[PDB]
Design a protein around this ligand. Structure first.
Ligand SMILES: CCCCCCCCCCCCCCCCCCCC(=O)O[C@H](COC(=O)CCCCCCCCCCCCCC)COP(=O)(O)OCCN
Ligand SMILES: CCCCCCCCCCCCCCCCCCCC(=O)O[C@H](COC(=O)CCCCCCCCCCCCCC)COP(=O)(O)OCCN
Ligand SMILES: O=S(=O)(O)c1cc(N=C=S)ccc1/C=C/c1ccc(N=C=S)cc1S(=O)(=O)O
Ligand SMILES: O=S(=O)(O)c1cc(N=C=S)ccc1/C=C/c1ccc(N=C=S)cc1S(=O)(=O)O
Ligand SMILES: CC(=O)N[C@@H]1[C@@H](O)[C@H](O)[C@@H](CO)O[C@H]1O
Ligand SMILES: CC(=O)N[C@@H]1[C@@H](O)[C@H](O)[C@@H](CO)O[C@H]1O
Lengths: 539, 539
């Protein structure tokens, strides 16, 4: 009976896939193919959610020492790197913000400014998120923006506009509005990261690779030039992504279905919403010292993030250069300071003697550990560590060299087809792995290939370098996806279906604006310059 | 203003202590003094519990990179080492045991065997824990035995004998009987570790140091001789520790409230308790496939623990020698296998068609991630990683060499006084640091100093090597204490007060049995052998 398959397919996958993928290991002798087998099995498990994602991420610890790739002590330390500490600290600080009810104040202020229309609110949030992510790391922006979205959704539910969760082990399912807002936040962060060389680590990585490999080159990837080259495309496909998201979930062009909610909100928003929102804001009262301290700490953390080695002026990392200090220091500093500081300052009435009442007990701090344990999604440690460890193991085993030597066979294709195929390959590879690792794998091969067939290296390097960052399908592809999926339970199926669109939008936009607008910034992109001839003759 | 001190002393300590400890860095020059300042501040925070322990353990991440001792990336990677993964996996497997109600079955079986008297049950549990900890790592035994103690306490409460917790945001306070049981488990593991070379890593460490430093030695610390030397003392002070614990938490020799509570137990539970217990056991059905599978996995895990490179026979770690498997493999393997396997095995009715309704749904696994997230104390990650990070920082900064040089000046004292002072110093230094670390910092100095004066090296090395493992005062001293404090909410003051007994008992017992019984096992211990003279002359 097919009912058997309908009920117990997950166990069938778990039991059958390794045996079916065994020939990959058995037919080939090198150590590379064992790592390839492991990667294939994990990918198949990730796509179908046969096992919980966190459990699947634990496999490398068992697998690598047996395969002979890395020692057990070396594997376990690849998890819990510096960047992972930064992510977890960001989550903790966001929880601290949520604890003092600051997010409700910000959400009410925003709704009061914009006008209480779900469409306009969505547009404003997307634009603000993109602009912020243009300057800071993506995960920080996503973790910052999650509670604000939560508060806005709660307000809309309170007005009776929409329901956050589907009506009834398994956590509650999210409604289409929730998916729209959260996926919008994540995609906006990922898209806005590409605007500036400070936006994400991938830009710095491939810029450094290009500068090191090619010197004595006329073209420069200077800070203003890169922004001049990248911003217009960013704007165009950000707007197109917003429109697609509105069409998919809110029925923008179709008044047959789902239009009822937005029109119903629009009709009553003119008077009732305006009369109610301001009163609710008044009911909060003046901002208290608790929130002032939390806000000051958050602003300090962001400023410290921005001013560490910005590249356009001296940074505080240049001072204190005895040992390499990275971004985890300010975050943990803030987390500790949250516990150290008090929340009232009402006890000074003893020394001042001006005040009558006394606390009659210890003054609570800014946050409590019981709150942090209950809310933090501790499973993310294994997922992100699995990504890092898998990348490092792929480096050491020798599979990255295998892929690089595999790609060299694309010299036959004409130029435009070659560019399109390169973009597609970059997207497909980055779907399953860290962006930085994919860039390291791909760029040098492209440089050598370009020198082989007499093409200006930038013409191929820049589109691929940008394309490495376009990942929208799976929670493992990029940290913002994982954070959003953890915060509000989002299943993989819905997110892949939703992401099927921005992939096409970004590919087409990147192709067209490259081939057309890149000439304006770099006039000699089509021609093959002299210094390239010198390098080719040398090689 | 006395009430002000009574209420707000914690924050007063937090504010004042760093300023008062600043002269340590200010007056002295080297980096080791900065490391010493950090260690002193963290110790004072640990003792008074001004901050949560988990928060205090985070300070090294901020402190070390600023002081220039270590880079930021290395410090974070020192956390979450291999051994920490082993501990966390052990906790997860214990939770898996708790999920399927196996612990109740084991507890009822034990109560049937022993006889349902709190005193006799406590004695039996202590002896069993000691015997197991002879052969396995201590943390494994503690994580093994926590749920069993929980189940036994629940049964006794259901009989109306005692109450686990005091009558009510903070977690509940445990009563005296709970403290007695849990502290007994932890102390029993620590004490029983010293019996055998395999028992703990400290024994292996100092045995290896002695063998490497002094070849050509007549006396041998092989497997049987060490056991012959160590077992009798271990039995004596285990028994004395049990007697002290009974005296302190129950009225063993005092007419008190606790004395009445225990003494009344025998009257009502002469035979009614036996009848009720047998009825309750018969109420439970026969073992299901769930419990059988969990038990098989647990036994497999323990066997893999034992058979990895023992001295007496060949181990599986010697095979697969390409990389160090290093014992994390079995634990994570078991954890993953728990999620992979099913629970009912009733779906085979499709193929066999023997009879019975089809499940009409997915079959649940052995455990669920929601259960794991709720129960595991996740702060233990930071609390245990702090020890490794702090130890490595101490090695690199240069503190350890400073302490070793400071220890030389003791050579002026006579022999027995020297032995006593050595034992005291070893205990004091192991209460704020990892046991293995203190051994590496103290043993070579003792070897050289014993060569300098005319003393047999074993006479000093062996008692100190045993003494390094006696830590009973703080949750940070040794992993069993941390696990017990996490599982049942135990404040530091109670543990610190209770730890006075075992410290004195062990110190006196080692002193006396060394000086008396050691000569029987190793004759000519007092005299200076020939090879010692050769080694001393060649210096
Ligand atoms: C020494 C190493 C190997 C140890 C192996 C131990 C286990 C041995 C076999 C135990 C019995 C398995 C019986 C399988 C019968 C065929 C499949 C029947 C249908 C089926 O898959 O039903 C699911 C059970 O599957 C399952 O139970 C699938 C998992 C089976 C065990 C895991 C095997 C992994 C092998 C990995 C290594 C391969 C070789 C590498 C060199 C329940 O389906 P459901 O949807 O109702 O429930 C999903 C879970 N909740
Ligand atoms: C960050 C944004 C700040 C914005 C401005 C906010 C206002 C000023 C904030 C700083 C104020 C510092 C001085 C506060 C008054 C201290 C009065 C005596 C101590 C006292 O009241 O003790 C507790 C408060 O402690 C405390 O309040 C001490 C908290 C820790 C202070 C810093 C400690 C480290 C200083 C040295 C660092 C560098 C060392 C050298 C490298 C009482 O409260 P409680 O004990 O009942 O409850 C504590 C929570 N549970
Ligand atoms: O990829 S590596 O772990 O080798 C790495 C080496 C670096 N060497 C230097 S300097 C600097 C960064 C770095 C990794 C960073 C990321 C790796 C994967 C990410 N997403 C996924 S999956 C996101 C980041 S991010 O924090 O940079 O955005
Ligand atoms: O302490 S060290 O990080 O130097 C260390 C070096 C090793 N080099 C090698 S091979 C092997 C193990 C090892 C650490 C072991 C422990 C360190 C601290 C502990 N408690 C505290 S605080 C308990 C243990 S345990 O593993 O004995 O349980
Ligand atoms: C000596 C030397 O480096 N000459 C190079 C020259 O070959 C190259 O064509 C030009 C453009 O980059 O830069 C300069
Ligand atoms: C001479 C040498 O290399 N080592 C000697 C060994 O032969 C002798 O047995 C021992 C005394 O027990 O003293 C040492």
């Amino acid at each position: 009976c097919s009912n058997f398959f309908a009920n117990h397919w997950k166990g069938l996958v778990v039991f059958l896939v390794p045996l079916l993928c065994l020939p990959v290991m058995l037919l080939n002798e090198g150590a590379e193919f064992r790592c390839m087998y492991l990667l294939l099995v994990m990918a198949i498990f990730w796509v179908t959610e046969a096992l919980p994602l966190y459990v699947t991420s634990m496999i490398p610890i068992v697998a690598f020492p047996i395969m002979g790739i890395m020692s057990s002590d070396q594997t376990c330390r690849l998890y819990f790197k510096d960047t992972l500490v930064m992510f977890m600290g960001g989550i903790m600080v966001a929880l601290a913000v949520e604890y003092c009810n600051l997010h409700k104040r910000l959400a009410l202020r925003v709704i009061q400014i914009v006008g209480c229309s779900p469409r306009r609110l969505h547009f404003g949030l997307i634009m603000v998120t993109m602009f912020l992510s243009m300057w800071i790391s993506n995960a920080a922006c996503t973790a910052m923006m999650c509670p604000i979205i939560q508060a806005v959704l709660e307000e809309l539910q309170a007005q009776g506009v929409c329901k956050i969760n589907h009506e009834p082990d398994e956590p509650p399912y999210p409604t289409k509005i929730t998916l729209c807002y959260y996926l919008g936040i994540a995609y906006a962060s990922s898209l806005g990261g590409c605007g500036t060389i400070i936006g994400t680590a991938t830009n710095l990585t491939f810029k450094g690779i290009y500068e090191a490999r090619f010197k004595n080159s006329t073209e420069q990837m200077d800070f203003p030039t890169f922004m001049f080259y990248s911003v217009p495309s960013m704007l165009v496909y950000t707007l197109l992504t917003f429109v697609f998201l509105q069409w998919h979930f809110m029925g923008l062009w179709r008044p047959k279905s789902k239009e009822a909610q937005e029109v119903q909100r629009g009709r009553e928003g003119a008077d009732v919403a305006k009369k109610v929102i301001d009163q609710r804001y008044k009911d909060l009262g003046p901002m208290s010292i608790h929130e002032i301290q939390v806000m000051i700490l958050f602003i300090f953390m962001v400023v410290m993030y921005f001013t560490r080695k910005p590249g356009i002026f001296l940074g505080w990392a240049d001072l204190l250069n005895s040992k390499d200090i990275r971004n985890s220091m300010p975050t943990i500093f803030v987390v500790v300071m949250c516990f150290m500081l008090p929340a009232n300052y009402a006890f000074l009435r003893y020394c001042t003697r001006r005040g009558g009442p006394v606390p009659t007990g210890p003054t609570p701090s800014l946050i409590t550990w019981k709150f942090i344990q209950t809310k933090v999604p501790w499973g993310l440690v294994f997922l992100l560590g699995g990504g890092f460890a898998l990348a490092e193991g792929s480096k050491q085993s020798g599979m990255a060299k295998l892929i690089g030597n595999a790609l060299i066979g694309l010299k036959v294709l004409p130029n435009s087809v070659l560019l399109l195929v390169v973009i597609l390959v970059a997207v497909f590879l980055t779907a399953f792995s860290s962006n930085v690792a994919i860039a390291n794998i791909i760029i040098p091969v492209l440089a050598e290939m370009s020198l082989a067939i007499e093409i200006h290296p930038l013409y191929l390097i820049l589109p691929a370098g940008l394309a490495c960052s376009m990942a929208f399908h799976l929670p493992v592809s990029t940290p913002p996806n994982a954070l959003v999926a953890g915060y509000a339970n989002i299943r993989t199926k819905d997110m892949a279906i939703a992401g099927i669109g921005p992939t096409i939008i970004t590919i087409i936009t990147l192709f067209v604006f490259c081939q057309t607008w890149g000439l304006v910034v770099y006039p000699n992109l089509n021609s093959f310059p002299e210094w390239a001839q010198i390098y080719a003759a040398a090689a």
